[PDB]
Amino acid sequence: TNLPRNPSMADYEARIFTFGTWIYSVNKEQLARAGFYALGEGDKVKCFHCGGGLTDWKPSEDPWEQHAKWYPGCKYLLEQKGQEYINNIHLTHSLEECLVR
Amino acid sequence: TNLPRNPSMADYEARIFTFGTWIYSVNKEQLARAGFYALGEGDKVKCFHCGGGLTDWKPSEDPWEQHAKWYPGCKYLLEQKGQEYINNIHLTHSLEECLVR
Ligand SMILES: CC[C@H](N)C(=O)N[C@@H]1C(=O)N2[C@@H](CC[C@@H]1CCN)CC[C@H]2C(=O)NC(c1ccccc1)c1ccccc1
Numbered sequence: 001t002n003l004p005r006n007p008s009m010a011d012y013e014a015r016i017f018t019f020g021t022w023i024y025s026v027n028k029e030q031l032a033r034a035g036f037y038a039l040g041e042g043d044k045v046k047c048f049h050c051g052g053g054l055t056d057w058k059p060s061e062d063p064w065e066q067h068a069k070w071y072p073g074c075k076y077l078l079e080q081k082g083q084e085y086i087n088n089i090h091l092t093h094s095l096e097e098c099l100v101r
Numbered sequence: 102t103n104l105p106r107n108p109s110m111a112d113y114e115a116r117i118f119t120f121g122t123w124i125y126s127v128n129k130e131q132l133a134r135a136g137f138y139a140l141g142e143g144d145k146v147k148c149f150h151c152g153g154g155l156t157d158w159k160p161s162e163d164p165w166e167q168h169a170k171w172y173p174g175c176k177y178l179l180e181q182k183g184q185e186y187i188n189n190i191h192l193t194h195s196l197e198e199c200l201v202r
């Protein structure tokens with residue numbers, strides 16, 4: 001019942017093709033696999049399914065982790081990585097905040 | 102490397118038979134799927150691969166959760182349930198403890 005917000009980008013290849021001019025350290029193959037396609041604008045990327053937008057990618061950041069961190073509600077993410085993966089990213093954040101602050 | 106501790110109980114078939122005569126509040130189907138077999142001695146069970154023993158099963162405890170809770174380093178558990186599930190169980194524990202006073 002949760003239709004993708006961008007059906008034309010539902011294909012992996014459809015997404016990698018948006019990374020023609022891709023000059024950034026974060027891997028194009030990983031970004032597409034994680035559901036993201038580039039917007040031809042900064043390093044801005046969007047998830048074809050949930051429509052989540054991400055920018056300012058740091059050297060060693062995982063597209064999957066960042067997808068779950070910011071947009072845990074994504075159906076595509078859930079089907080690819082499962083509940084555990086998602087809940088883990090969020091359990092970690094809470095534990096860490098709880099241990100420090 | 103990590104050779105199974107009781108090689109004879111590797112087959113699901115071998116484990117289920119160990120129950121049959123089973124009078125306890127925990128589902129024997131799941132225990133066997135989780136890698137456990139009964140000892141015909143209380144409600145004591147043991148995992149075929151890691152040798153981890155469990156006892157005193159409450160009404161609604163999950164064989165897999167309990168396995169991960171007490172014996173996180175079991176190879177069979179890792180191959181069956183994966184990294185995320187295991188860490189998941191332990192993160193929750195950490196987060197809980199760390200949250201309660
Ligand atoms: C992806 C890893 C990166 N280091 C990061 O965490 N980026 C965050 C981010 O992309 N967003 C969060 C803000 C904190 C970060 C940005 C500041 N370094 C909130 C959602 C996202 C974001 O800023 N998205 C953009 C956007 C819009 C459209 C397409 C792609 C990205 C945004 C801009 C303006 C308003 C709302 C969202």
Ligand SMILES: CC[C@H](N)C(=O)N[C@@H]1C(=O)N2[C@@H](CC[C@@H]1CCN)CC[C@H]2C(=O)NC(c1ccccc1)c1ccccc1
Nearest residue numbers: 140144145146147153154155156157158159162167168171
């Ligand atoms: C499995 C769920 C249950 N509620 C539970 O948590 N049981 C624990 C348990 O089985 N073990 C932990 C102790 C707390 C529990 C027991 C009393 N609530 C530690 C390991 C295990 C346990 O008691 N194992 C037994 C044992 C021995 C041989 C076969 C099976 C179980 C044990 C008894 C005495 C010494 C060492 C281990």
Ligand SMILES: [Zn+2]
Nearest residue numbers: 047049050074
């Ligand atoms: Zn998404």
Ligand SMILES: [Zn+2]
Nearest residue numbers: 148150151175
């Ligand atoms: Zn085990």
